[PDB]
A paper describes a structure:
The biocatalytic reduction of the oxime moiety to the corresponding amine group has only recently been found to be a promiscuous activity of ene-reductases transforming α-oximo β-keto esters. By studying the crystal structures of enzyme oxime complexes, analyzing molecular dynamics simulations, and investigating biocatalytic cascades and possible intermediates, we obtained evidence that the reaction proceeds via an imine intermediate and not via the hydroxylamine intermediate. To gain more insight into the reaction pathway, we determined the crystal structures of the two enzymes OPR3 and XenA in complex with the oxime substrates 1a–c, either by co-crystallization or by soaking. All the crystal structures obtained had a high resolution (1.9–1.35 Å) and showed clear electron density features for the oximes.
Residue numbers in the entry: 10 to 286, 297 to 384
Write the structure that this text describes.
Amino acid sequence: NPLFSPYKMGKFNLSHRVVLAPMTRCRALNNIPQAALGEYYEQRATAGGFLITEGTMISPTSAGFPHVPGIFTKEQVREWKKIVDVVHAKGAVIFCQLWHVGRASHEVYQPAGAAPISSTEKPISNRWRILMPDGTHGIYPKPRAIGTYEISQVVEDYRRSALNAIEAGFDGIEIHGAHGYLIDQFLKDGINDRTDEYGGSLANRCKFITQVVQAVVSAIGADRVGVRVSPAIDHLDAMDSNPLSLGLAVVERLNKIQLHSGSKLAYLHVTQPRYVASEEEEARLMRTLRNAYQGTFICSGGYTRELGIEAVAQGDADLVSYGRLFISNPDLVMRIKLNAPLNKYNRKTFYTQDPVVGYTDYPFL
Ligand SMILES: Cc1cc2nc3c(=O)[nH]c(=O)nc-3n(C[C@H](O)[C@H](O)[C@H](O)COP(=O)(O)O)c2cc1C
Ligand SMILES: CCOC(=O)/C(=N\O)C(C)=O
C-alpha cells in the first residue's frame, strides 16, 4: 500500500500519507476551542499521522461560520494548547489552518454588524446562501473593499496568528488561500476588480497571497507553513478566466519564496476541481500544478481509498487528505490500512454545535 510508506515533510517524519483535511465543524463555542475539539482530534490522531485543523480565525472579522475557533486571543491559545497536547500524546503532527472568509460572511458574524471585508464590493450572488447561527440561511451582503493599509494589517493578523499557533504548540500552520475566501477573492479575476497594486494583472492578484505566505514564513519558518489553493472550484462565485495560469503563477511565487528563504514550505495543498459543498481537464490541472511546484503536494477533494492509493502510486501527490470520510471514521487511517468498510457520514451534523452527536460518537471498528 503506497499510502503507508513513510514520508518526510520537512522536519516531520510522517508514518503514513493519510491526512486529516481541514474541516469547519462549528463546535468551538463562542470561537473558543472546546474540550469537544480535543476529543475529536485525539480520536483521529495516529502515530506519525498529519492532522490539519478546521479553519481558524485570525481576527474578529475573519469569521463567516458560527462557533469556529480563533487563535488571535490568549484565551484561544491556552485552550488550543490543551488540544495540541492530546494530539501530540498520540504521536501525530498537527497544523492550524488560518482562515479569513472575507466576503463569505454576514452582518451577524461581524463585530458591530459591520460589512465583511474583501478585495471588491461585489457580493456573492443569490445562488449561494450562508448558514446562520440559528440554522436558517441568510443572504451574503455587499463587502467593503479594503485599501492597502488594511491589507497590511490583515497580513499582520496572519503573522500574529502564526506565532500564536506555535505558542499553542502547533507543529505549523496552513494558509487557507482557497475556496473563494479572503485570499481567493484577491487571486481570482472573477472577483478581484481592483485597479490598484493588488488587482488588474495576474502578478497583482498574486501579491496578497505572496505577502501573507512571506510574513508567516518569516514568522515561524518556511518548513512550518503550508499553503492551500483551489485555482478551479465551484464555490462562492470564485472563478478565474484562466485557472491553470493562476495556479501556475501562485506556484512560481511559492517556489521563489522557498529559494529566497533557503527552505522548503511544508507543502502545497490543492483542491481537486470536482469537489463542491471534463475529468481529464481536472486531473490535468492537478498534475500540472504538482509537476511545477518544488516540494510536497497534498491533494484533496473527493478522494477514496482507491483514488488515494493511485494518487501516491502514480506520483500525482505525496500526501492525500480526507474530509468527509474522516468525519464519520475516526480510525480512517486504520480502516484504509486494513481496507475495512467505512462508516457513512451525516451531513446534517457537519455544522451543528453538539459536542458529541455527529462529532465524537462515530464508532471505531
Ligand atoms: C464539513 C466540512 C468542513 C470543511 N471545512 C473546511 C475548512 O475549514 N478549510 C478547508 O480548507 N476545507 C474545508 N472543507 C474541505 C476539506 O478540507 C476537504 O478538502 C474536502 O472535504 C475533501 O473532500 P472529501 O470530503 O471527499 O474527503 C470542509 C469540508 C467539509 C465536509
Ligand atoms: C467546497 C470548498 O469549500 C469548503 O469546503 C469549505 N471551506 O473551505 C466549507 C466550510 O464548506
